[PDB]
Amino acid sequence: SVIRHFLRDDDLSPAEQAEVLELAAELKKDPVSRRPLQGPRGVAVIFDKNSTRTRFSFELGIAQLGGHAVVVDSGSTQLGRDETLQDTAKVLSRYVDAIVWRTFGQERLDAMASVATVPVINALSDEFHPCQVLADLQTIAERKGALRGLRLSYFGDGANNMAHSLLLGGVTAGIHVTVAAPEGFLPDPSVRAAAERRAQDTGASVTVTADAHAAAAGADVLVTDTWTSMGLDRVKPFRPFQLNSRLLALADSDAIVLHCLPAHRGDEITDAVMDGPASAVWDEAENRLHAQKALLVWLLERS
Amino acid sequence: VIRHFLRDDDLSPAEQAEVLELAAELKKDPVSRRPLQGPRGVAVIFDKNSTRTRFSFELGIAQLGGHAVVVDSTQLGRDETLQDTAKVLSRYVDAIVWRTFGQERLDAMASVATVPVINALSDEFHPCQVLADLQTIAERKGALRGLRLSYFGDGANNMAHSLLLGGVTAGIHVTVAAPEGFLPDPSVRAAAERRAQDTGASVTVTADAHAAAAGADVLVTDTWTSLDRVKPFRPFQLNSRLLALADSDAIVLHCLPAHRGDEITDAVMDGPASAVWDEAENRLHAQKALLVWLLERS
Amino acid sequence: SVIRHFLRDDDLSPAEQAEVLELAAELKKDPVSRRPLQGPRGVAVIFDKNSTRTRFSFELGIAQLGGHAVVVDSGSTQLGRDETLQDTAKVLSRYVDAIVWRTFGQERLDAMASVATVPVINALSDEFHPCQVLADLQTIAERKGALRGLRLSYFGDGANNMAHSLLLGGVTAGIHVTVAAPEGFLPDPSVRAAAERRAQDTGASVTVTADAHAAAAGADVLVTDTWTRVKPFRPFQLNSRLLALADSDAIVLHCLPAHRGDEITDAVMDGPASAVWDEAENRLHAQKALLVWLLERS
Numbered sequence A: 001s002v003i004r005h006f007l008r009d010d011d012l013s014p015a016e017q018a019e020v021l022e023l024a025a026e027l028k029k030d031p032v033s034r035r036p037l038q039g040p041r042g043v044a045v046i047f048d049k050n051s052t053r054t055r056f057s058f059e060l061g062i063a064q065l066g067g068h069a070v071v072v073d074s075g076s077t078q079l080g081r082d083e084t085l086q087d088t089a090k091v092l093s094r095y096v097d098a099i100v101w102r103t104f105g106q107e108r109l110d111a112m113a114s115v116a117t118v119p120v121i122n123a124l125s126d127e128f129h130p131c132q133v134l135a136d137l138q139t140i141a142e143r144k145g146a147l148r149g150l151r152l153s154y155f156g157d158g159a160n161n162m163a164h165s166l167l168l169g170g171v172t173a174g175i176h177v178t179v180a181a182p183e184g185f186l187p188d189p190s191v192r193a194a195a196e197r198r199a200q201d202t203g204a205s206v207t208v209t210a211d212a213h214a215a216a217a218g219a220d221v222l223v224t225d226t227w228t229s230m231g232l233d234r235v236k237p238f239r240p241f242q243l244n245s246r247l248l249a250l251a252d253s254d255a256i257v258l259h260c261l262p263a264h265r266g267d268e269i270t271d272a273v274m275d276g277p278a279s280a281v282w283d284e285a286e287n288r289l290h291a292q293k294a295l296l297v298w299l300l301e302r303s
Numbered sequence B: 001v002i003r004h005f006l007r008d009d010d011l012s013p014a015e016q017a018e019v020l021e022l023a024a025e026l027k028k029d030p031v032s033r034r035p036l037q038g039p040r041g042v043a044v045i046f047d048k049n050s051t052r053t054r055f056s057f058e059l060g061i062a063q064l065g066g067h068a069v070v071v072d073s074t075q076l077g078r079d080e081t082l083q084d085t086a087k088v089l090s091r092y093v094d095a096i097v098w099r100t101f102g103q104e105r106l107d108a109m110a111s112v113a114t115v116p117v118i119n120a121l122s123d124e125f126h127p128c129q130v131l132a133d134l135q136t137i138a139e140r141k142g143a144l145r146g147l148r149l150s151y152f153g154d155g156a157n158n159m160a161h162s163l164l165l166g167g168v169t170a171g172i173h174v175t176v177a178a179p180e181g182f183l184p185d186p187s188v189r190a191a192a193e194r195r196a197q198d199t200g201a202s203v204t205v206t207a208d209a210h211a212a213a214a215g216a217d218v219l220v221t222d223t224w225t226s227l228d229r230v231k232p233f234r235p236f237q238l239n240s241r242l243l244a245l246a247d248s249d250a251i252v253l254h255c256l257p258a259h260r261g262d263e264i265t266d267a268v269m270d271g272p273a274s275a276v277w278d279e280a281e282n283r284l285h286a287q288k289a290l291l292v293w294l295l296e297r298s
Numbered sequence C: 001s002v003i004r005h006f007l008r009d010d011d012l013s014p015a016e017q018a019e020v021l022e023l024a025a026e027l028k029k030d031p032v033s034r035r036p037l038q039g040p041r042g043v044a045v046i047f048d049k050n051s052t053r054t055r056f057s058f059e060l061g062i063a064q065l066g067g068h069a070v071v072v073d074s075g076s077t078q079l080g081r082d083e084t085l086q087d088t089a090k091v092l093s094r095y096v097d098a099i100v101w102r103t104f105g106q107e108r109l110d111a112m113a114s115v116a117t118v119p120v121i122n123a124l125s126d127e128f129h130p131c132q133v134l135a136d137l138q139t140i141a142e143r144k145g146a147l148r149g150l151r152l153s154y155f156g157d158g159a160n161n162m163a164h165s166l167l168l169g170g171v172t173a174g175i176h177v178t179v180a181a182p183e184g185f186l187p188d189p190s191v192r193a194a195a196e197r198r199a200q201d202t203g204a205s206v207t208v209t210a211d212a213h214a215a216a217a218g219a220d221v222l223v224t225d226t227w228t229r230v231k232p233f234r235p236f237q238l239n240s241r242l243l244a245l246a247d248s249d250a251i252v253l254h255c256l257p258a259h260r261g262d263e264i265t266d267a268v269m270d271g272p273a274s275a276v277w278d279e280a281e282n283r284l285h286a287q288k289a290l291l292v293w294l295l296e297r298s
Helices: A014-029 A052-064 A085-095 A106-115 A130-144 A161-172 A189-202 A212-216 A236-241 A281-302 B013-028 B051-063 B082-092 B103-112 B127-141 B158-169 B186-199 B209-213 B231-236 B240-245 B276-296 C014-029 C052-064 C085-095 C106-115 C130-144 C161-172 C189-202 C212-216 C231-236 C240-244 C276-297
Strands: A042-047 A068-072 A096-102 A120-124 A151-155 A176-180 A205-209 A221-224 A256-259 B041-046 B067-071 B096-099 B117-121 B148-152 B173-177 B202-206 B218-221 B251-254 C042-047 C068-072 C099-102 C120-124 C151-155 C176-180 C205-209 C221-224 C251-254
Touching: A014 A130, A014 A161, A014 A189, A014 A281, A042 A052, A042 A085, A042 C052, A052 A068, A052 A120, A052 A281, A052 B041, A052 B067, A052 B082, A068 C052, A085 A096, A085 A106, A085 C052, A085 C276, A096 A106, A096 A281, A106 A120, A120 A130, A120 A281, A130 A161, A130 A221, A130 A256, A130 A281, A151 A161, A151 A212, A161 A176, A161 A189, A161 A205, A176 A212, A189 A205, A205 A212, A256 A281, A281 B082, B013 B127, B013 B158, B013 B186, B013 B276, B041 B051, B041 B082, B051 B067, B051 B117, B051 B276, B051 C042, B051 C068, B051 C085, B082 B103, B096 B103, B103 B117, B117 B127, B117 B276, B127 B158, B127 B218, B127 B251, B127 B276, B148 B158, B148 B209, B158 B173, B158 B186, B158 B202, B173 B209, B186 B202, B202 B209, B209 B240, B251 B276, B276 C085, C014 C130, C014 C161, C014 C189, C014 C276, C042 C052, C042 C085, C052 C068, C052 C120, C052 C276, C085 C099, C085 C106, C099 C106, C106 C120, C120 C130, C120 C276, C130 C161, C130 C251, C130 C276, C151 C161, C151 C212, C161 C176, C161 C189, C161 C205, C176 C212, C189 C205, C205 C212, C212 C240, C251 C276
Parallel strands: A042 A068, A042 A096, A096 A120, A151 A176, A151 A221, A176 A205, A221 A256, B041 B067, B041 B096, B096 B117, B148 B173, B148 B218, B173 B202, B218 B251, C042 C068, C042 C099, C099 C120, C151 C176, C151 C221, C176 C205, C221 C251
Antiparallel strands: none
8 A cells, every 4th residue: 555645635636535524524423433543553743833732633633543642842853953854754654653743844744755654644834734624624514514616715814824725625625715815925826726726626616816805705614814923014914804794794694704723803803703603613623633533544544 | 510620619618528538539449430531631731830730630630531631831821812712622621720820810711611620720729739638638637627737838828828728628727827928818818717617617827836836737838939038937947846846646748849958857858747748649639539520510 | 579770771680681672572572462551550751851762662662551651851840950859759659650761960860769669760861871772682682583692893982871881781681792982982981890790690791992893893783873072983983894894694773863974874874784773663662671570570
């Protein structure tokens, strides 16, 4: 068997993504029914930059698969510093059955996956956040049923990891994806091109616009994210793209709202939207647990 | 209907007795209760690290079948509202154990979270330590009601407050001996006096260490702080002279860490009256009992 | 029972070391067949300086014995600062069944072992790396069989923890150990004397030389380690020319991380003589065997 990895959303085909999302629903119903890591077998969970919420979901999910997560956070040097990435992959492959890694550049994830003899999962990177989008898709399916043909609009910084993963993971699910963002913060054209190509296979589509009202019109799902990872109002370009009540009122009447969290209330999203009946952000956060477990189960049995 | 444990008197006298009975049962049979089998998660969050709090809660949770997710010292409230954090945590874990500074943050967390919240240690109270202390006293002396306990040193800190509230809840006559600038918060002292009326207990605050030692069944101290700035406390040192004024079978407690030569001497801490190591062990058993009890009422 | 510790390689007798290494092979074959820590019981894994590869091997090994590792990284209050190491050891002994510690000076390990009522294990220290050498010996045995009478040569910094442990652990196994190192980086004289005395009981021997080529001739095993002060060590590089002077079926060991191009070349590291990846894996099995063995004697 070829060792399978999950570094970006389109690493799964449409049929494979459906398998993972079905497993995510099964594991939400029966969270300790799959024990591929019984022993326990180990899974490495490595953070080049800390993300506490990413750690809750993986550390508990791995335990519920019977395994033991070995968590390495930023306070432990950095992978690649005092020995080669390739040497690190070879040793980790002797201790664990999968490697979950939060890092920056995609080329590091690619290099890890090409040498490691166990599955590598992108927990969060500069370019993609594919585990979050699996959780988003599970949440949408819970609220609306079939994903094919839904219209999803993302608002704010369209150049970030969530914009890229909503494009790739969304069109893989057959969802018509719109990114609404100011012209200096648009999807990477290579990512957009890959999303357009995948969308041809699923009947989906890709739209990029700087007109937030047009992007909201008739949408089934509205998504946003913090505008920056960290005087001058540097986020001024994004404020017209705030997910507020006026924007939500332009979408379909049964539309839902997603936000990967943490939220900066009053910036990219308002209290009224976050706390209103369209919000699915709390189920979405919970589904990180289930969708990541499903991904691990699926990768381990193909690898 | 979700119960929390933020300060000692959050348990009634009857409820405290239930938790302490469970603590003795779990010490005998440490893996006999598995309410967190799965594993289910419990959050263990430190705004400031504590090694003994980490060992006792992390292993206790594991022995209940659970998995502790331990978060060390971005601080809660900085990247998102405490209320948003409380909602996300409630989807991931069955209880939240939190070491933080101000009591108002614990109150805020408990008012929003839909799972039990436990104060692992705060500026104002250390109620899990006092559960361990009460378990230790009971196994050395039997019935708690009517015992005389004196605490010495900094009478304004979390241990003084919790020994007052938790002690009188158990029916113990509690004395705090401290210099006048370091006495119990009057609101806490009043709450302990009111609770003592239900249990036959009493509250005494004094600056006379020798009077407080006389007739005591249990002597307790704690580090004085967390130029001799601690000079005010040195007359309140728990030493052999002070111990010799107490009952001949008195025992000595100290929440740890100890600064030997300051609040307690080597001779007392390593001598036959010391119960400090059993007391430390009982952090594990008493906190396990508390979690079992809160989980079944929530 | 006498509580057994493992702070340096000669804390095991020759017969005891053979028992641990036999157990390591058994546990490599059947990794979850021994569950002395079921419950879970706890094991402390404490780092004064982080070592992620020590963390992986111990944390998963403890889990595979059925236990729960409580892992403490650097950046909490360094042990010894807010209470004595002895007090820390006495409290840890009430929470866990063994203490695994990566620290600096040997006197710190001695301090905890002096009062602990559970086994204390040196995970890695300034003076010794005895768990790595157990893994090394397991690796050598599974490729070459009987250890007595083999020839092992270590190259480079002969004053560091690996040189010391290869001396002590090697002669305990009956191996003729050579340290090839430059002046100013030679073994500590008390360690050298202890290894010479232990070699008398096993038929082993100790050689210390600046002649790297002579040290390679006839060797079954060539070992090196990071040099960190680079100029003195260049003649001791483990390169293809040096390896060719050894036995035709010699194997190469290196406690990771390797600095390729410095103490070892890519050709050696990635060639057919390299046993470094099996060596790293065997930290898991050898440490699990050590824990099983210490627990059942303590």
